[PDB]
Each structure stands twice: as C-alpha cells, then as structure tokens.
Amino acid sequence: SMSVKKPKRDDSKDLALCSMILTEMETHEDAWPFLLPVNLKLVPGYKKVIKKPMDFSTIREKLSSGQYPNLETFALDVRLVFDNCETFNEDDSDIGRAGHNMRKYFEKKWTDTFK
Numbered sequence: 532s533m534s535v536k537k538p539k540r541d542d543s544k545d546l547a548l549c550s551m552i553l554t555e556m557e558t559h560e561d562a563w564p565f566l567l568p569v570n571l572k573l574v575p576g577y578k579k580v581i582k583k584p585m586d587f588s589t590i591r592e593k594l595s596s597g598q599y600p601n602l603e604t605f606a607l608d609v610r611l612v613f614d615n616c617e618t619f620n621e622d623d624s625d626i627g628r629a630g631h632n633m634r635k636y637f638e639k640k641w642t643d644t645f646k
Contacts, residue, residue: 545602550594552640556609557587559636561629565612581619585611602645609637 556562568586571578590608599605616630 542602546594548644549599549602549605552637552644553587553591553594553609555640556633556637557591559633561632562587564616564626564629565633577619581615583611583615585615587612606641610634613637 557566565587567588568584569577569581571584577584585608590605590612593599593608594605599608613630613634616626620627620630622628622631
C-alpha cells in the first residue's frame, strides 16, 4: 500500500532472459507453425474464430520495441500462441502436437529461469 512495499525483486535482466527463451522457442524444430502470423486471407475460419492472433515473430518485434511492460505480459502472449493453436487444431494433427510440445518446452524454461 502507500509507503509500504515488499522488497525489490531484481528485474534488470528480464528483457535479456525473455529474449533468450524466445530464441530457444524460435530454433525448436517444432516451431514452424508459429514462426509467422497465420495468413488471414488464405486460411478459412481463422480471422473469425481467433480473436487475438499471436506468433513468435510478432512477439519478437514487441519485445524488441518495448511493448512488454513486464515479464508476465510476455508470458501471456507466448501462452496465447498455444491457446490459439489448441482452439483451431485437433490434438492428433501435426500442428496440434507441435503446440503441445512447444507449450511444454516453454513452461519448463519459464520455471527454470524465473521460479
């Protein structure tokens, strides 16, 4: 509250560390569905169904231009990529499996880096 603060957690390396994680996600062999924005002209249903599209290139550009206020807003966008993928893709499809695998990969790196 006013004039009452928990001790200052060191957040000075968060930007660098989120960039490292994102690099690891970009280079994963199962990243291919997620590297670029889904082409809304060429994929029926996507525009209407997925209210907030997100992809790794969009996250990288937001990261690089100071559009994440803190590491939680970064994790929210990463999780949105995988939540969108589960909304649109069957679990037993190459893309559906890719998104489960990547979500797992991310959540471990997130815990190991920050928790």
